[PDB]
């Protein structure tokens, strides 16, 4: 499934991938390191250790990225 975190970029993720995974994608485009990001949807912020599932995040949804 696509999401996306916002200069938007685009994501392309399975429902059960791990917010580490979320964030080394994002590195890889922004070059921002994992333990720089705070990433947050729907006020809540996404830790490294559980899954897009988890926090119930399906398709087309928008994480929102802060540096930390």
């Given at each position: 499934m696509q999401i996306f975190v916002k200069k938007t970029i685009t994501l392309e993720v399975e429902?059960?991938?791990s917010i580490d995974a979320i964030k080394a994608k994002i590195q890889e485009k922004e070059g921002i390191p994992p333990d720089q990001q705070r990433l947050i949807f729907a006020g809540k912020q996404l830790e490294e250790?559980?899954?897009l599932s988890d926090y119930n995040i399906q398709k087309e949804s928008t994480l929102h990225l802060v540096l930390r």
């Open positions: 429902p059960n991938d250790g559980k899954t």
